[PDB]
Amino acid sequence: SQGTTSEYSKYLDSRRAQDFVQWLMNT
Numbered sequence: 001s002q003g004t005t006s007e008y009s010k011y012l013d014s015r016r017a018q019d020f021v022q023w024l025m026n027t
Helices: 006-010 015-026
Strands: none
Protein backbone atom coordinates (compact mmCIF):
# COMPACT_ATOMS: atom_id res chain seq x y z
CA SER A 1 0.00 0.00 0.00
CA GLN A 2 1.04 3.61 -0.75
CA GLY A 3 -0.66 5.27 2.26
CA THR A 4 -0.69 8.95 3.31
CA THR A 5 2.45 10.53 4.90
CA SER A 6 2.39 9.70 8.68
CA GLU A 7 0.32 6.57 7.89
CA TYR A 8 3.02 5.08 5.61
CA SER A 9 5.81 6.47 7.86
CA LYS A 10 5.13 3.50 10.19
CA TYR A 11 5.79 0.90 7.44
CA LEU A 12 8.77 3.01 6.34
CA ASP A 13 10.35 2.97 9.86
CA SER A 14 11.50 -0.25 11.62
CA ARG A 15 9.65 -3.62 12.05
CA ARG A 16 6.65 -2.77 9.82
CA ALA A 17 8.95 -1.74 6.95
CA GLN A 18 10.59 -5.20 7.22
CA ASP A 19 7.16 -6.87 6.97
CA PHE A 20 6.29 -4.62 4.01
CA VAL A 21 9.45 -5.55 2.06
CA GLN A 22 8.98 -9.27 2.89
CA TRP A 23 5.38 -8.94 1.65
CA LEU A 24 6.16 -6.91 -1.49
CA MET A 25 8.83 -9.51 -2.33
CA ASN A 26 6.51 -12.53 -1.87
CA THR A 27 3.91 -10.72 -4.05
